[PDB]
Design an enzyme around this catalytic site. Structure first.
Site, short mmCIF file in Angstrom:
data_model
loop_
_atom_site.label_atom_id
_atom_site.label_comp_id
_atom_site.label_asym_id
_atom_site.label_seq_id
_atom_site.Cartn_x
_atom_site.Cartn_y
_atom_site.Cartn_z
N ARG A 1 0.96 6.99 -0.07
CA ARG A 1 -0.09 6.10 0.82
C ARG A 1 -0.91 5.78 0.03
NH1 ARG A 1 -3.08 2.75 2.59
NH2 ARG A 1 -2.98 1.88 4.95
N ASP B 1 -5.96 -0.85 3.07
CA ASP B 1 -5.55 -1.59 4.06
C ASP B 1 -5.12 -2.95 3.63
OD1 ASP B 1 -6.99 0.24 6.66
OD2 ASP B 1 -4.88 -0.46 6.60
N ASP C 1 0.89 -1.27 0.13
CA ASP C 1 -0.03 0.01 -0.11
C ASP C 1 0.68 1.29 0.26
OD1 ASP C 1 -1.33 0.09 3.47
OD2 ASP C 1 0.70 0.41 2.78
N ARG D 1 3.53 11.66 3.96
CA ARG D 1 3.08 10.87 2.73
C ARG D 1 1.91 11.42 2.02
NH1 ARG D 1 2.32 4.70 5.39
NH2 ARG D 1 0.92 5.94 6.59
N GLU E 1 0.78 -6.07 5.80
CA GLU E 1 1.98 -5.47 5.74
C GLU E 1 3.38 -6.51 5.73
OE1 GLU E 1 1.55 -2.10 8.04
OE2 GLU E 1 3.72 -1.45 8.16
#
Length: 135
Positions: A29, A34, A15, A81, A37
């Site tokens: 971003r 979502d 992402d 970001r 990660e």
């Protein structure tokens, strides 16, 4: 909303991507999504993280043209970001990830929510198709 040209510098995560935008290197971003990660010790390398990560990277790496689309709200988050919809040859990376069940739709902060309905639609299809995350 309008698209602006940008150049890939480096994919960082499912992402998160680093782009050259208006002559400046900047980390973006992806808005409203979502992704599992590969980073952060307050998780680590979560499930599908490496998959989401390879999908974003191939998608931006193999594109002829990358474009950024800011939403109507703030355009930076507290970490500096950029907050944008990212397009690879006309295809929205944010939507593709969600359609493939490699991301969920994020808690949404108006007014940065223009494509919210579109993505929720893709997310319901990925869940209906029981893809990756939804398997």
């Amino acid at each position: 909303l309008h698209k602006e040209p940008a150049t890939l510098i480096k994919a960082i995560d499912g992402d998160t991507v680093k782009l050259m935008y208006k002559g400046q290197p900047m980390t973006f971003r992806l808005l409203l999504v979502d992704s599992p990660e590969t980073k952060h010790p307050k998780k680590g390398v979560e499930k599908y993280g490496p998959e989401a990560s390879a999908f974003t990277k191939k998608m931006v790496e193999n594109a002829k043209k990358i474009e950024v689309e800011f939403d109507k709200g703030q355009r930076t988050d507290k970490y500096g970001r950029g907050l944008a919809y990212i397009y690879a040859d006309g295809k929205m990376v944010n939507e593709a990830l969600v359609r493939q069940g490699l991301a969920k739709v994020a808690y949404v902060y108006k007014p940065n929510n223009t494509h919210e309905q579109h993505l929720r639609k893709s997310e319901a299809q990925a869940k209906k198709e029981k893809l990756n995350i939804w398997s």
